[PDB]
Amino acid sequence: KEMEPLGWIHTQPNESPQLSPQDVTTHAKIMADNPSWDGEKTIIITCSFTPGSCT
Amino acid sequence: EAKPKFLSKAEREAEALKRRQQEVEERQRMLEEERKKRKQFQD
């Protein structure tokens, strides 16, 4: 309650050089469905499953 | 200060109720400011 939602994080099996459209659509739907999720503060973190690492 | 001035027990209960009312008013003002900030960010 004392903390603000800074967005959401998700993992991806492939290294995407650009932004994902489905994740951006889910972030836009979460920003439109919740008034406390402002677009200037909420972000999307993508963890690309690198071989032996994580980007 | 060096020598604090306490009050009566009913006066202490009234001071605690006044502090709770001031905290509730500050929380209501913070909620109004948050609603105004949300209305400014949405528009």
Next chain:
Amino acid sequence: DEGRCVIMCQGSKKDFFKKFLYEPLPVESHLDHCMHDHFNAEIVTKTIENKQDAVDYLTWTFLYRRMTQNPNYYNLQGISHRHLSDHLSELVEQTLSDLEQSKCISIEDEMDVAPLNLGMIAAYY
């Protein structure tokens, strides 16, 4: 030439006994649990005649110095002057209620503390 100190205890109390041996142990005043006898002795000797005199007598002890350095050890919610004054007023009101419920003191206008017969008999012996 030296002195050996072997403390044989349980495994759960080994870390506390090792921490409280080399490091200096801080002092914490526990006068909030036994303040009724001190309040009765201050009221019977005409020292704490009101709430302000009782707060001034309680501020001259080690508990007021320990509350300014460890607020959570004295069940306080802040190191500010207003929260400490409210905690001292609540403690004084609890002591006055414990003295008035036991017929040891009298509360003129709920603030003026007067020594009764039972409080004087408790503070005398």
